[PDB]
Amino acid sequence: MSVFVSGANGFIAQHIVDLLLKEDYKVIGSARSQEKAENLTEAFGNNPKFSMEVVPDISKLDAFDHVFQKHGKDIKIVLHTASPFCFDITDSERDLLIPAVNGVKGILHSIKKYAADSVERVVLTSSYAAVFDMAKENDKSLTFNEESWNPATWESCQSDPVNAYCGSKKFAEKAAWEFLEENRDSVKFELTAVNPVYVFGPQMFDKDVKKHLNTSCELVNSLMHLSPEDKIPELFGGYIDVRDVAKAHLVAFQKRETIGQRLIVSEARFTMQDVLDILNEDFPVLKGNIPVGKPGSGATHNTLGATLDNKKSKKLLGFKFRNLKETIDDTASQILKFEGRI
C-alpha cells in the first residue's frame, strides 16, 4: 500500500503528502537533489512511513527508472505532479514542448518496464490550460467543460510564450491518454487527470512563504504590496484552494468513478477586484495602504466571461470547495504572519 508522488516538494504536492500520511499511506516522493529530499523529510519530521528518492531532471525519459526498478513491486499508486524544472521561450519545441511531453512519457515507460503489473492507478496533475480557449474566456455566450480541449496545435501554440506554455500542458496530458490507449493490454493501471485553475491557499509550511510562492499566490502578494494609487492588473479565471486540489488527487485514485476522467478543480470565477475586496475588508493592517478599485464589480458578483461548467467534476469528487474569501484569507494571513505583521 505505497504511493509515489513525483516532485513532492511542490506547492500542491506537499499538501498531497500531508493528506496521504494523515490517511496512513506509505509515501515515496521525488526531489531534484539530496538537500531538497532531506529538507522535506525533515519538514514532515522524519515520519518512518515517508521516504524520498532523488530525480534531478524529469525531462529525460529514464529519469524514473531507478525508483521503479528499486520500488516498482511496492508502488500501487502514482501521483505524477512534477513538471520540467526549467524552460525557455526561443525554440519552444526543444526547450518547452518536447520536454513537457517526455516529462509524462518517461514515468509511464518506467512503469511499463519495472511495474507493469503492480501500479493500479496513475493520477496526472494537468491544468485548465489544457481545457480552455484563451481567446474565448471572455465570451459570455460560451461554455467549457471536462470534454473541452485547448484548440492550439503543436505549430500554432508556438506563436508566443504564453500560448506555448499552455500548449505544452495540452500535449503533456494528451501523451498520457495516448500511452494508456496504446499500451492498455501491457499495463494494469487506470489514468485520471486533475485540472486545476488558478491555485491559491497556504503553503504547507510557514517557512516556505519567502521563496516558494507559486504564480497565483504571487498575485495576492503583489496586491498586498501595491500603493493606494497603483494600477490594478486585469485578470479573469477560475480559482481553487490548494488543499482542495490536494484532496482531489486522493479522490482521483480512491474512487472507481474517477477512472478515465478529467477533473476540473475549480470553485468559481474571480478577478483581481474580488481579491482586493477581500484584502480590504478582512485585513485592518492593509486597509488604507492598498488600492481599493471598484468594490463589488468583480466576478463574485457578476458574470464576466465564459461559463466554466465543471458540475461533473464536482459531482464525481463529492466534496465542497473553499470559497474565494477563505482561500485568500489563508494565503494573506500566512504571508502577514511570515512578515510578523500578524
Next chain:
Amino acid sequence: MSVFVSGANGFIAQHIVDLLLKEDYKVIGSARSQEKAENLTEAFGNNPKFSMEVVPDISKLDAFDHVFQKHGKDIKIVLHTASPFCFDITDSERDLLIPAVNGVKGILHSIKKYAADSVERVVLTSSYAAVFDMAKENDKSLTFNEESWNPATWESCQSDPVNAYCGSKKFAEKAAWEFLEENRDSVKFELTAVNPVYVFGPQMFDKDVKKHLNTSCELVNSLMHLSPEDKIPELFGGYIDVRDVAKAHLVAFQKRETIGQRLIVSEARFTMQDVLDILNEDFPVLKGNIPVGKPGSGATHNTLGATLDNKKSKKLLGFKFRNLKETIDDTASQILKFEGRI
C-alpha cells in the same frame, strides 16, 4: 584586434559575427555546447579568423575565466550578447533574477581578473525592457528615453512571469553600470548598452527558419498561418531589423561618442495590424488566405501609446534604420522561400 562575442549562435549575434568578419576582425565566440560551436563554425565556412569556445552556463561566475585567461592579451572588444538559458516562474528570484545578474557579473569579473589592461570596450546587449514602464506603454502623454529605467523593483517585478522577465533585464544592465562605477580604477574598458525593441528580420542562414525563429519573428510566422476568419493578437511596441541591431553593436564599440551610453535601437512603433497590412500587400501567395483585419488602423498611421524618444541614440549611431515594410518583407520572404512557396 580580436572581438569576443558571447552567445555567438543567437539571432542577433550571428549577424554581428557576419559583420565583424566582413570588416576583417578576428572573432572569438562562445556557445553553450561543442555541437553548437561546431555547427556555427561550419556555417561560417570554417573561416580561420573565427574561433569558438564552449561556455555551458553563463550564470556561473567563473564561466568566462578560461576564455579570458587564454585569450585576454588579444581580446580588445567584448560584445556580451548571451543571456541565461532556461528559466522558471515559481522561484523567480533563484531561477530568473539571480542568474540574469550573475550572467553579467561573471564576464566582467573575468575581464577584471584576466584582461584588465587589454579590453578597451564592452558592449552589453540589454533591452528596451530595462527602459520602459510596461503599464504606462499605453499612455500617449508619456515619453521614455535613454535615461528612462523600468521602475519595477527586485520584489515588485516578481508579481508575474512577464514582469519578472522584464525586471531581470533591468537588474542585469544595472549590474553592468554598477560594476564599472565600482571598479573604474582597476579596469581599462568603457561600457555601452544596446537596448533593442522587438527584433524582426532574416536569420543569417536560411536553414535556420525551421527551428530558430526568435519570439518576434515567430509572431510574423504565426500571422502567416492564420485563416481569413481568425482573430489578430493585440500587441504594441517598437520594431527594429536584426541587421540594424547587429550594426549598432559595432558602432557602439567603434565610436568615441557611444562611450558610457545606453542606445535604444528602435525605428518606429508597430501593432500586428501593420504587420498584416505588409503581408497582404506584398505577398500574392498570402493575400486571400490570411486575415485582413482593419487595414491602416495600426501604429504606422496612428499614435497608440507612449512616445519612444530615441532621437539621441539615432544621432549617435549615425545610420538610418530599415522600416517595417523592409524588415517584415525580408522576414516573410525568407520563410516563404524556405517553405518553397516563393
